[PDB]
Design a binder for this molecule. Structure first.
Ligand SMILES: CCCCCCCCCCCCCCCCCC(=O)OC[C@H](COP(=O)([O-])OCC(O)COP(=O)([O-])OC[C@@H](COC(=O)CCCCCCCCCCCCCCCCC)OC(=O)CCCCCCCCCCCCCCCCC)OC(=O)CCCCCCCCCCCCCCCCC
Ligand SMILES: CCCCCCCCCCCCCCCCCC(=O)OC[C@H](COP(=O)([O-])OCC(O)COP(=O)([O-])OC[C@@H](COC(=O)CCCCCCCCCCCCCCCCC)OC(=O)CCCCCCCCCCCCCCCCC)OC(=O)CCCCCCCCCCCCCCCCC
Ligand SMILES: CCCCCCCCCCCCCCCCCC(=O)OC[C@H](COP(=O)([O-])OCC(O)COP(=O)([O-])OC[C@@H](COC(=O)CCCCCCCCCCCCCCCCC)OC(=O)CCCCCCCCCCCCCCCCC)OC(=O)CCCCCCCCCCCCCCCCC
Ligand SMILES: CCCCCCCCCCCCCCCCCC(=O)OC[C@H](COP(=O)([O-])OCC(O)COP(=O)([O-])OC[C@@H](COC(=O)CCCCCCCCCCCCCCCCC)OC(=O)CCCCCCCCCCCCCCCCC)OC(=O)CCCCCCCCCCCCCCCCC
Ligand code: HEA
Ligand code: HEA
Ligand SMILES: CCCCCCCC/C=C\CCCCCCCC(=O)OC[C@H](COP(=O)(O)OCCN)OC(=O)CCCCCCC/C=C/CCCCCCCC
Ligand SMILES: CCCCCCCC/C=C\CCCCCCCC(=O)O[C@H](COC(=O)CCCCCCC/C=C/CCCCCCCC)COP(=O)(O)OCCN
Ligand SMILES: [O-][O-]
Ligand SMILES: [Cu+2]
Ligand SMILES: [K+]
Lengths: 459, 100, 186, 92, 73, 90, 100, 47, 141
């Protein structure tokens, strides 16, 4: 059979396959954006059809996060190797594992069908009210997808937590990363469901939470209470993969295993109580802003320890071993890229600096370096490491120095200018812009078209 | 004619002599929504005692305009004129203490 | 860390000790099925986690972060004027909430604000004392600091009397320049 | 028998430095205490609101009876305590 | 868990019920039953309501009577 | 302990650190109190810290201050270099 | 039989937490000097004077607040057309006679 | 005031208020620290 | 206790790490060979040496844990155990009694007083002319 299969390793493959398929739509949406931003004036989107652009950015953000990266890093690799890293045979809850991947597909079909049938309007991937609750039915459809996706995420989190009961070996660092990510989902998802229901209530049940005398900022607190743990849920599995790749490909025992494990735990605890650095410009109390700013900076301490522990893993490795394997290059590239993304995150953590850089392309570049480069490269690196175990072929990616170099150069061309544009300044979620920002936007656009061409070379 | 006369009498007086500065009761917060509601309630009570024509209540309205946007005031003034403004309901006709 | 089960492990009395940890570690464990095996696994975990020197660094960090977290939560409820828990003031119109207004001014003047506000001149180059004077009196009059903020501020001299242009850029001098032209009052 | 109670100097918070008094537009020095009165009143706002309430209560009396001296003395004591901490910094 | 003896010190058997003859006074029987089944459940169960009841009903004196006699205006 | 490598704590204070589990708890408790104390003792206290006349002047302050005072630099530094907007056009 | 939590954990951490919250609040009030006397009344001085007049008998009983103001909204103008305080008092007087 | 072509404007440009200067100075204050963090780590990415 | 714990409250399988204290040490003892004296050099390893059923105490522990599951009569626990088993049940029952016989009477009294005096007996009477019951929990005002 193909749909009835409960084998966890098969389901892991399905997660990877589905993420690539949905990735194409996400890439298409991303390509539409940079083509439009090539220069001032409409290029592929009519001025009378600006609503479509708002939908493109809204779906680009939603699909890439919930439908592409999260299934790939939290559903794909973990379902394949996690029961193997544990001494157990298969996943604890086989039937739940089957329904989780099916749920992800159905939610994807609902989302894309809504593009085709409903009027195309957008409110951003964060769905801030009141804009989200004064829109058309496409917003209702997107909410159903998120709620449905939430069901799959929570049941998958329950599945991984049960490994603690049955694990017959040692809890490796990678296993810890998945377990702690599951803990974050369990504590953050129910809060997300509650606020999403309130959005539906206003949209569909004549609720008045998001009109005058009802604080709209209420949504931002509850949403970001899940929002920031989500970004840490995306990256923590990537950290686990990097730890395995560096140790395995260098024949070096992981240094400071317990320090690595405690760093992951510390990040989750801190990541659950710093959500309001997304709300600096709303006008919070003085003491509130100081607290979140102070605690946000503290997240760098555990994150820094992991970076240094990774570096010493690569240092001193035997020279005779060939170092040009794509998996090793991607793992090393992650350290270089993540540091850039994290440092810029610390810059925008300072709230007064953030006043100028909120809702600008500097924030875009910040999370693209971490997610579009780092997370993707970590997912690529893990899949490459498991090529023999997974057994896929008909691609030239294992030893391809051209692909690694071209990818690194061109992605940096896309997003380095966006840091510069942030100070110029160019707002986010914008289709037109002043003529004097064209040069930097043009350079990034040339970077985007180049990256897409490179992907065709792997086949 | 005293240095601390502003504070003496009322905390209200502080912004009556300095309309464009922060009110002591709401200076700690950037959000001034509660400040606008207090100012409007003060204007409503002035008219009840002194009447609209009184210059004092005219200035109280000006104080409200200093912190209340016009789109809010137009809506709230409409409710006040009809008689459905919850701020201006006479105390003996309030329902806050009823049924709990 | 002993390597023989015959040698006992020293334990203190209290709610977080070796004995306290042993009693609860194996409550949910399917692997600690007999004394010999249970002790071996218990000492294995204790050796791996509590005898790891770098682990104690994270213990300090979680304590500090949680301590700040609890204090800020508690401070808002206790002192923040805008936070209501009792209902007496919420049953009255805004002008009548006299008890709540008592929190306003003291909550507006925390110690740290007074200490650090004078150090604005480490950031602003022109007229760092533009907002120092306020005749209303809700806050103290500010006086610019005489030294740079410790740390990463190597751009400016260690003390402001070493800067030849510091006095010329003060709000007083600029006010003198513009008043001489009749340009503005400030 | 004697004017003051002696203390260690570390207990006595004598001003470290001297700030000259502000000068009026006319050119005459303004009293430091008068400049500090508005600030210290704010620091004693709680007592001031209690005094302010008393004024309104006695205002709404048909009879002439009523005084607010008790509340005023509490406010005055608080304001002066604030002044004492900072006044000598402006006095030679 | 600290092992400890059974604290019940009352009679362990009253004998066969014979039309309610040769049995203790009713109040003594109630005391024995609670001793047998544990006073800890009684105190825990009643603690919440006692605390709430005392706090609310204390206001009859603390909030109502005292306030009338203690208002400086 | 604060800013202390615990290997030093193990070495120099064996008896105190004999119970590692208890030692870990004290590490958490000690740093919890510090964080709690900072908020309520350093940040919270109202109407304090405004004695700007008592700025701390460390020995390094006086060393540099006297060095410039001895020469004319201190007088020159404090002098207002410009107090007019427009220069006179010849 | 092995115990994981405090022997009396539920009562300990419920009453104990409530006690600590109450004691902390009292300390906070002392530090800031907040008045702790409870007033259940609105503080509008003019209105309280009118209520005292009703209690003294200067103003007839059951007289509405809108009958005493210098500015009336539209809804109050509607009610004033049907207001008869004298009739209301007579009706109450009749009820008392019937009851006794 | 307004964006200009091909400008890095690293940290901001053209402040007109004392607060605007503060924003730029804060970024410049931390910028050298950011370089130190990057350079020190990257230099050790090697066998 | 309600919740199942592998270590202590293992009622699903009934496994116990140690035998009952009734048995003499000669008959059965806890599986502890930490105090075994050093093996003479001339002795040779015949068995695996692996921790498992080759050790007599572990074999007897496994055997007893299976054969204890059939017994002629109940092994009666003491009243302390029986109290703990239904601690929540007994306490909830007493909580119901407290609601009926403590809360009910004074809540009824307050409503009757409120009828006559317009406010509960534990509240300050208002002079502001507003009508209605007002607050109930006075200390939260
Ligand atoms: C009280 C009141 C009572 C009222 C009573 C009223 C009753 C009402 C009833 C209501 C319920 C009705 C449904 C009941 C279902 C019963 C299930 C059951 O028991 O089945 C046994 C039955 C056993 O079959 P069998 O009779 O033994 O014969 C099977 C074969 O002999 C060989 O066996 P097999 O299992 O191997 O074969 C199946 C499989 C074999 O074929 C293959 O697998 C082909 C090879 C793979 C090629 C690569 C595919 C791409 C990679 C995907 C990777 C991820 C996969 C994840 C796992 C699979 C998820 C489906 O082919 C398929 O079934 C199709 C596979 C589809 C894969 C989809 C992958 C993603 C596609 C992405 C699309 C991207 C474009 C976007 C736009 C379009 C969006 C739709 O199940 C099946 O095998 C068939 C299932 C068919 C039902 C599927 C329904 C899907 C609905 C989707 C939502 C559509 C809504 C929106 C429409 C939009 C259109 C545009
Ligand atoms: C005034 C108030 C006073 C109150 C006093 C209250 C006293 C309470 C006493 C509590 C005593 C606990 C006793 C049991 C200890 C654990 C034993 C255990 O689990 O046995 C394994 C047992 C399986 O039996 P087994 O066969 O022996 O397992 C063999 C191993 O798998 C094979 O592994 P292996 O042999 O290789 O390694 C052994 C060990 C290896 O691992 C260990 O040995 C870990 C040892 C450390 C654990 C943490 C201890 C506490 C540390 C101090 C924290 C203080 C914070 C203070 C804050 C104050 C703020 C005011 O493995 C495990 O422990 C596996 C389970 C780990 C679960 C972790 C879940 C995430 C929690 C966060 C991690 C802890 C971070 C601590 C802080 C870090 C920063 C300093 O696990 C299970 O039964 C699994 C059940 C899974 C259920 C999941 C769903 C639960 C519901 C979730 C709700 C949401 C949770 C949110 C969490 C948020 C986290 C950030
Ligand atoms: C002011 C007046 C008004 C007051 C209103 C109060 C309202 C309260 C609402 C409560 C709603 C009901 C909830 C409980 C329903 C069930 C009741 C029941 O059956 O009780 C009797 C029964 C008594 O059990 P027993 O075995 O007969 O005990 C006999 C003796 O009592 C002696 O037993 P033992 O001492 O020997 O121990 C055996 C027993 C002892 O356990 C119990 O008996 C449990 C009793 C609990 C009762 C509820 C009290 C309130 C608990 C508050 C907890 C707050 C968490 C922290 C929140 C932080 C927020 C920032 O152990 C178990 O049964 C194990 C259960 C599994 C525990 C799993 C915990 C997972 C979460 C761990 C923490 C995660 C955060 C880590 C952070 C640090 C990271 C480094 O309880 C159970 O069997 C219930 C267990 C199953 C339900 C567990 C639910 C766990 C939920 C975890 C949520 C974690 C969220 C984390 C994130 C939060 C922040 C984002
Ligand atoms: C000259 C002037 C003179 C002036 C003189 C003035 C005189 C003034 C006198 C003042 C006196 C003050 C006295 C202070 C010292 C107190 C000392 C003391 O004894 O403290 C400890 C004492 C009891 O603590 P303890 O010793 O730990 O208890 C022993 C236990 O047996 C421990 O044993 P355990 O732990 O085994 O206990 C049993 C436990 C065993 O646990 C288990 O079995 C394990 C499982 C536990 C977890 C359970 C999970 C959930 C269970 C699910 C089932 C739920 C069923 C109910 C469902 C309801 C559905 C609607 O289970 C339970 O207890 C829980 C289950 C039972 C049902 C729970 C029902 C829900 C509870 C939560 C809600 C509470 C709020 C309700 C509000 C109303 C309704 C909305 O604490 C208190 O009584 C609190 C102190 C209150 C102070 C109030 C002060 C203010 C009021 C002043 C009044 C007088 C003023 C008059 C005016 C004067 C003006 C001058
Ligand atoms: C995987 C995704 C991911 C990850 C890991 C992070 C990690 C971090 N993020 Fe990010 N973030 C996003 C995804 C992510 N973020 C997204 C998607 C947004 C925008 C959402 C939206 O608005 O739509 C965002 C937005 C965002 C904002 C702005 C929110 C707004 O106002 O709009 C801020 C502000 O501080 C921030 C901070 C941080 C910080 C401080 C970290 C830290 O974890 C980084 C820590 C890492 C380092 C610091 C580098 C490693 C450490 C060292 C090299 C040594 C130590 C270094 C120092 C002490 C400086 N993020
Ligand atoms: C995982 C998340 C993810 C990923 C990969 C990307 C990838 C890219 N994104 Fe981004 N983007 C977001 C998440 C992501 N993005 C979010 C959350 C926003 C904010 C939404 C909002 O404004 O509300 C955003 C916003 C955003 C904007 C701003 C829109 C606006 O405000 O007007 C732009 C503009 O160019 C952009 C461009 C790009 C480009 C050019 C790429 C890529 O082309 C970069 C290079 C990548 C490739 C060439 C493809 C490589 C292959 C994969 C990524 C799939 C791999 C799959 C597997 C391994 C299974 N993105
Ligand atoms: C959320 C509202 C719910 C109302 C519930 C009513 C029932 C009351 C009893 C249960 C709730 C506990 C609160 C009881 C309070 C009793 C005393 C009281 O009235 O306090 C009021 C006072 C403020 O009221 P006002 O005077 O109107 O505001 C002044 C300016 N801010 O309230 C408080 O300060 C207490 C409220 C918070 C109590 C909870 C504890 C706070 C700290 C939480 C820390 C959380 C982080 C983690 C802690 C870990 C600890 C191990
Ligand atoms: C039986 C199990 C019961 C478990 C119940 C768990 C309840 C809590 C679940 C999580 C939700 C937390 C509540 C949400 C708190 C939001 C507070 C908020 O947004 O307030 C901020 C201010 O809040 C703060 O100062 C931030 C404090 C951070 C609160 C975090 C609470 C939840 C933390 C959960 C982390 C995970 C658990 C950690 C456990 C210990 C780890 C060692 C807004 O301030 P302003 O808008 O400026 O308004 C101020 C006055 N106008
Ligand atoms: O979100 O960072
Ligand atoms: Cu964030
Ligand atoms: K364009």
């Amino acid at each position: 059979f193909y749909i009835l299969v409960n084998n966890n390793k098969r389901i892991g493959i399905y997660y990877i396959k589905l993420s690539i398929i949905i990735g194409i739509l996400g890439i298409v949406l991303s390509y539409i954006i940079r083509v439009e931003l090539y220069n001032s004036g409409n290029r592929i989107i009519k001025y009378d059809n600006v609503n479509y652009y708002n939908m493109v950015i809204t779906l680009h953000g939603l699909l890439m996060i919930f439908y592409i990266i999260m299934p790939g890093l939290y559903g794909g690799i973990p379902l394949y190797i996690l029961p193997i890293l544990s001494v157990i045979t298969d996943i604890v809850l086989p039937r739940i594992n089957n329904i989780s991947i099916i749920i992800v597909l159905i939610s994807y079909i609902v989302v894309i069908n809504s593009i085709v049938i409903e009027y195309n309007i957008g409110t951003g991937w964060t769905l801030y009210p009141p804009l989200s609750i004064i829109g058309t039915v496409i917003v209702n459809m997107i909410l159903y997808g998120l709620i449905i996706i939430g069901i799959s995420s929570i049941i998958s989190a329950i599945n991984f937590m049960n490994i603690l009961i049955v694990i017959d070996g040692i809890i490796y660092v990678y296993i810890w990363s998945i377990i702690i990510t599951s803990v974050l989902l369990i504590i953050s998802l129910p809060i997300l469901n509650g606020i999403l229901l309130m959005i539906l209530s206003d949209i569909y049940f004549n609720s008045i939470y998001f009109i005058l005398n009802g604080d709209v900022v209420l949504y931002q607190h509850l949403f970001w209470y899940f929002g920031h743990p989500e970004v840490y849920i995306l990256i923590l599995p990537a950290f686990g993969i990097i730890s395995i790749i560096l140790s395995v490909l260098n024949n070096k025992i992981i240094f400071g295993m317990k320090s690595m494990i405690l760093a992951i735990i510390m990040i989750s605890i801190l990541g659950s109580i710093v959500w309001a650095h997304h709300i600096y410009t709303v006008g919070l109390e003085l003491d509130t802003k100081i607290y979140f700013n102070n605690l946000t900076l503290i997240i760098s301490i555990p994150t820094g320890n992991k970076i240094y522990n990774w570096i010493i893993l690569y240092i001193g490795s035997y020279n005779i071993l060939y170092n040009g394997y794509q998996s090793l290059i991607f793992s090393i590239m992650f350290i270089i890229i993540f540091i850039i993304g994290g440092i810029t995150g610390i810059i925008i953590s300072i709230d007064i600096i953030d006043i100028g850089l909120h809702d600008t392309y500097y924030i875009v570049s910040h999370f693209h370096y971490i997610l579009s480069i780092g997370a993707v490269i970590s997912l690529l690196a893990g899949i490459l490491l498991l090529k023999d175990i997974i057994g896929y072929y008909n691609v030239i990616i294992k030893i391809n120095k051209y692909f690694g170099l071209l990818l690194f150069i061109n992605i940096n061309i896309i997003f380095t200018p966006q840091f510069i544009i942030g100070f110029n300044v160019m707002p986010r979620r914008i289709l037109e812009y002043s003529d004097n920002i064209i040069v930097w936007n043009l350079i990034s656009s040339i970077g985007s078209i180049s990256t897409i061409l490179i992907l065709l070379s792997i086949f | 004619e005293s240095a601390d006369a502003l504070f003496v009498g009322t905390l209200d007086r502080l912004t009556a002599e300095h309309p464009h500065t922060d009110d002591p009761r709401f200076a700690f917060q950037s959000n001034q929504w509660n400040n606008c509601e207090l100012r409007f309630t003060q204007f409503c009570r002035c008219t009840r005692e002194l009447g609209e024509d009184d210059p004092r209540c005219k200035y109280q309205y000006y104080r409200a305009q200093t912190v209340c946007h016009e789109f809010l005031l137009e809506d709230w003034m409409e409710h006040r004129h009809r008689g459905t403004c919850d701020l201006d309901i006479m105390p003996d006709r309030q329902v806050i203490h009823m049924r709990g | 860390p002993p390597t023989r089960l015959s040698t006992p492990l020293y334990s203190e009395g209290g709610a977080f000790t070796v004995n306290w940890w042993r009693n609860r570690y194996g409550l949910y464990s399917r692997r600690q099925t007999d004394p010999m095996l249970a002790e071996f696994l218990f000492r294995q975990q204790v050796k791996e986690w509590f005898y790891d020197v770098p682990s104690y660094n994270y213990a300090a960090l979680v304590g500090l972060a949680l301590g700040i977290l609890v204090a800020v939560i508690w401070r808002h409820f206790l002192f923040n004027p805008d936070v209501y828990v009792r209902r007496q003031e919420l049953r009255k119109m805004w002008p009548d909430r006299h008890r709540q207004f008592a929190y306003a001014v003291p909550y507006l003047n925390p110690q740290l604000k007074n200490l650090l506000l004078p150090y604005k001149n480490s950031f602003i180059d022109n007229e760092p004392d533009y907002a120092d004077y306020n005749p209303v009196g809700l806050r103290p009059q500010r006086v610019m600091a005489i030294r740079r903020i410790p740390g990463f501020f190597w751009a400016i001299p260690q003390y402001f009397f070493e800067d030849p242009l510091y006095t010329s850029c003060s709000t007083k001098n600029m006010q003198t320049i513009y008043k001489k032209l009749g340009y503005s009052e400030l | 028998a004697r004017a003051y109670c002696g203390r260690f100097a570390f207990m006595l918070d004598y001003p470290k430095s001297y700030h000259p008094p502000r000068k009026n537009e006319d050119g005459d020095y303004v009293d430091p205490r008068t400049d500090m009165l508005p600030k210290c009143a704010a620091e004693c706002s709680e007592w001031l609101t209690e005094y302010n309430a008393c004024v309104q209560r006695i205002k709404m009396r048909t009879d002439g009876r009523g005084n607010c001296q008790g509340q005023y003395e509490e406010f005055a004591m608080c304001q002066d305590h604030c002044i004492a901490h900072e006044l000598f910094h402006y006095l030679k | 868990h600290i092992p400890h003896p059974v604290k019940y010190v009352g009679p362990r058997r009253y004998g066969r019920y014979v039309y309610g003859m040769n049995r203790p006074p009713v109040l003594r029987q109630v005391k024995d039953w609670i001793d047998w089944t544990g006073w800890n459940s009684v105190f825990g169960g009643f603690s919440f309501q006692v605390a709430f009841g005392l706090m609310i009903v204390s206001g009859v004196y603390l909030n109502n009577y005292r306030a009338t006699h203690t208002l400086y205006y | 302990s604060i800013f202390t490598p615990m290997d030093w704590m193990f070495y120099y204070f064996p008896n105190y650190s004999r119970d590692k589990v208890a030692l870990m708890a004290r590490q958490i408790k000690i740093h919890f109190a510090i964080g709690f104390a900072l908020v309520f003792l350093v940040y919270h206290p109202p109407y304090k810290g405004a004695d700007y006349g008592n700025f701390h002047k460390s020995p390094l302050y006086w060393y540099k201050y006297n060095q410039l005072e001895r020469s004319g630099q201190l007088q020159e530094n404090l002098r207002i270099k410009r107090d007019w907007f427009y220069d006179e056009d010849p | 039989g092995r115990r994981l939590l405090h022997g009396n954990y539920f009562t300990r951490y419920l009453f104990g937490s409530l006690a600590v919250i109450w004691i902390a609040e009292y300390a906070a009030a002392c530090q800031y000097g907040i008045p702790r006397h409870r007033n259940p009344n609105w503080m509008w001085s003019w209105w309280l004077e009118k209520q005292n007049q009703i209690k003294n008998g200067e103003i007839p009983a059951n007289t509405p607040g809108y009958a005493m103001v210098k500015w009336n909204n539209e809804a109050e103008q509607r009610w004033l057309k049907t207001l008869n305080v004298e009739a209301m008092n007579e009706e109450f007087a009749r009820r008392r006679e019937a009851y006794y | 005031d307004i964006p200009w072509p091909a400008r890095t404007d690293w940290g901001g440009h053209d402040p007109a208020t004392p607060f605007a200067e503060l924003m730029i100075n804060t970024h410049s204050m931390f910028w050298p620290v950011a370089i130190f963090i990057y350079v020190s780590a990257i230099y050790m990415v090697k066998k | 206790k309600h919740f199942f714990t592998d270590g202590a409250n293992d009622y699903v399988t009934g496994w116990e790490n140690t035998p009952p204290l009734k048995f003499p040490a000669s008959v059965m003892k806890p599986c502890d060979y930490s105090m075994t004296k050093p093996i003479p050099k001339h002795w040779k390893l015949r068995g695996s040496g692996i921790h498992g059923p080759e050790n007599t105490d572990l074999m007897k522990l496994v055997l007893w844990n299976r054969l204890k599951q059939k017994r002629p009569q109940r092994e009666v626990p003491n009243i302390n155990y029986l109290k703990d088993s239904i601690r929540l049940e007994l306490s909830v029952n007493w909580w119901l009694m407290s609601c009926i016989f403590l809360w009910g009477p004074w809540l009824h009294w307050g409503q009757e007083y409120q009828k006559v005096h317009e406010q509960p007996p534990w509240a300050m009477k208002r002079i502001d002319g507003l009508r209605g019951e007002g607050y109930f929990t006075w200390f939260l005002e």
